[PDB]
Amino acid sequence: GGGGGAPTAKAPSK
Amino acid sequence: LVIWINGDKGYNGLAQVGKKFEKDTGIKVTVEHPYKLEEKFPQVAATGPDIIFWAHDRFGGYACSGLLAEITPDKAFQDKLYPFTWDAVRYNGKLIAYPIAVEALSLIYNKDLLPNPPKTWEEIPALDGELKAKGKSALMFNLQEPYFTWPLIAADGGYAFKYENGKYDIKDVGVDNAGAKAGLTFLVDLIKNKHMNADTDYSIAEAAFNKGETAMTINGPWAWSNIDTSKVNYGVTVLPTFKGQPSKPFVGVLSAGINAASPNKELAKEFLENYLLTDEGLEAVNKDKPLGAVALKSYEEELAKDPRIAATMENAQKGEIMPNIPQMSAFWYAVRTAVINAASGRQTVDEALKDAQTNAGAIVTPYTIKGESMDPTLKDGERVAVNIVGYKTGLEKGNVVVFHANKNDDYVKRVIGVPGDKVEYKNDTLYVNGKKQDEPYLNYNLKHKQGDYITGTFQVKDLPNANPKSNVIPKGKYLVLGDNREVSKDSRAFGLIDEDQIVGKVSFRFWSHPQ
Ligand SMILES: OC[C@H]1O[C@H](O[C@H]2[C@H](O)[C@@H](O)[C@@H](O)O[C@@H]2CO)[C@H](O)[C@@H](O)[C@@H]1O
Numbered sequence: 001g002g003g004g005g006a007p008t009a010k011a012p013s014k
Numbered sequence: 015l016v017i018w019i020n021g022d023k024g025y026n027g028l029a030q031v032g033k034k035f036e037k038d039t040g041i042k043v044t045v046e047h048p049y050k051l052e053e054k055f056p057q058v059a060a061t062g063p064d065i066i067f068w069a070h071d072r073f074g075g076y077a078c079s080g081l082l083a084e085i086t087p088d089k090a091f092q093d094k095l096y097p098f099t100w101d102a103v104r105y106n107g108k109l110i111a112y113p114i115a116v117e118a119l120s121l122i123y124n125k126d127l128l129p130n131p132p133k134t135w136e137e138i139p140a141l142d143g144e145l146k147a148k149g150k151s152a153l154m155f156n157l158q159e160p161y162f163t164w165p166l167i168a169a170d171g172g173y174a175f176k177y178e179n180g181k182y183d184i185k186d187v188g189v190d191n192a193g194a195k196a197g198l199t200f201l202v203d204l205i206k207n208k209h210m211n212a213d214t215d216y217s218i219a220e221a222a223f224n225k226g227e228t229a230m231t232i233n234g235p236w237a238w239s240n241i242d243t244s245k246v247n248y249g250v251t252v253l254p255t256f257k258g259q260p261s262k263p264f265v266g267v268l269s270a271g272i273n274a275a276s277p278n279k280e281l282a283k284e285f286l287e288n289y290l291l292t293d294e295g296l297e298a299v300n301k302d303k304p305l306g307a308v309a310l311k312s313y314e315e316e317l318a319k320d321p322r323i324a325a326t327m328e329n330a331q332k333g334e335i336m337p338n339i340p341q342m343s344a345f346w347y348a349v350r351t352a353v354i355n356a357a358s359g360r361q362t363v364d365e366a367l368k369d370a371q372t373n374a375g376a377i378v379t380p381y382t383i384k385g386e387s388m389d390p391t392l393k394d395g396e397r398v399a400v401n402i403v404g405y406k407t408g409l410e411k412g413n414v415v416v417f418h419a420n421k422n423d424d425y426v427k428r429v430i431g432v433p434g435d436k437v438e439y440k441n442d443t444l445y446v447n448g449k450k451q452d453e454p455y456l457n458y459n460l461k462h463k464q465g466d467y468i469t470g471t472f473q474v475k476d477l478p479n480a481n482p483k484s485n486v487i488p489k490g491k492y493l494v495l496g497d498n499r500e501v502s503k504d505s506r507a508f509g510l511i512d513e514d515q516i517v518g519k520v521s522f523r524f525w526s527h528p529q
Contacts, residue, residue, distance in 0.1 A: 011383055011394070
């Protein structure tokens with residue numbers, strides 16, 4: 001494909 | 015303007031076009047030819063050249079990464095170039111580069127050593143016997159780049175990605191079919207019988223042919239200049255057949271793309287449309303290193319008179335236009351590895367092409383990590399590569415997975431249990447299928463903890479989406495935990511995740527490897 005920036009993978013905390 | 019073009023092309027000629035542009039406009043043009051530029055470009059794209067020259071196959075990947083501006087030629091300009099050349103530089107409906115020239119590999123041969131070039135690959139072993147008897151060899155060409163070995167691999171039926179009904183099917187890879195195996199086996203047999211050496215690279219073969227040491231090489235039109243200088247009496251001819259089938263080179267269209275981050279897109283457009291892609295501009299480059307069959311109709315009408323261009327196009331017609339899709343990069347890398355490992359004996363042909371088959375179709379996509387729950391394994395802000403996992407396909411304990419958590423968010427956690435696995439924690443001790451399993455990736459956090467234990471006692475049966483009667487993880491379900499166990503919000507909080515949430519596995523570089 002789309003030309004967009006890379007997606008985000010969250011590493012979430014409690 | 016800064017311009018990047020490969021070191022084997024007519025960069026001095028291109029510089030002369032650059033000088034004419036400067037003389038007319040005052041705007042200075044710098045032509046560079048960096049080592050492995052096709053790989054450097056994506057790093058520096060957002061810093062590098064205003065214009066990048068490469069065969070069209072690399073450009074879909076660049077565009078997919080947002081590294082290229084859409085080019086805007088009007089109808090009048092488009093009509094000056096062969097329609098098929100514009101096809102090569104179209105990605106997702108948009109024109110993403112200017113096509114310059116069609117390149118196909120040919121058989122190049124020394125007429126004084128070999129007045130009649132062989133019709134078939136099969137003849138080469140015997141021919142080499144004769145040439146060795148006078149201290150020569152039959153054939154030397156670049157074994158380090160799959161571009162050069164591809165024509166033989168594809169001869170009897172190998173292919174990259176199947177093109178059907180207007181689309182490439184990247185699930186349909188033809189790297190390990192019978193034809194590919196037969197071609198690569200023949201190549202390895204040549205090496206086993208010392209008719210070629212596994213270490214022969216571009217410069218070794220070029221020097222050998224130009225010094226009259228070998229009767230034949232395989233190369234593109236850009237190579238003819240050096241052969242002219244060497245005074246070898248050469249011919250350019252159709253590649254030999256293999257098992258009766260023509261060799262099938264992958265055909266490249268040398269193309270010029272414009273950096274999306276360039277503040278000189280309008281000047282780039284002027285240079286390419288009005289200086290380079292003219293009879294005069296192409297002649298300057300061609301006279302330095304020949305371009306092949308040029309995309310500009312008016313100039314090709316002259317070049318097509320050359321018997322060597324007729325031979326180039328004849329070989330092209332037996333081969334196929336390279337795909338320009340982003341996956342092309344993975345294909346080349348996979349095939350390069352296969353040929354190197356087969357040729358050196360590290361792997362058998364079957365082993366090599368089996369791996370190449372897997373690797374060529376494996377989709378790899380970038381992600382950026384946000385948050386602390388995987389620290390220190392992955393840090394906040396860290397850029398990673400994610401190997402996309404096919405629908406209902408091989409997730410394993412220890413894989414770090416990206417998955418859709420909800421409509422808005424993807425998460426990253428480690429797979430601690432797969433379907434069928436019985437799992438529980440006793441304090442910080444992991445039990446899988448009745449056996450304690452070491453978790454070395456928790457070592458740092460285990461030794462720098464705030465509390466008594468980082469994970470804590472829990473059983474799968476107590477978690478959401480589990481079978482409340484068993485610690486055996488249900489079908490289609492996964493137990494995932496973050497490496498920063500003391501802070502991580504993971505399966506302990508939200509329960510088991512489903513197979514259909516999973517996007518892919520994070521690839522890791524191991525810090526140690528052999529020398
Ligand atoms: O060997 C894999 C390599 O093949 C092609 O690169 C060619 C290029 O097209 C030619 O212009 C010439 O410079 O030789 C190169 C081979 O060394 C593909 O274009 C490239 O993407 C691929 O990595």
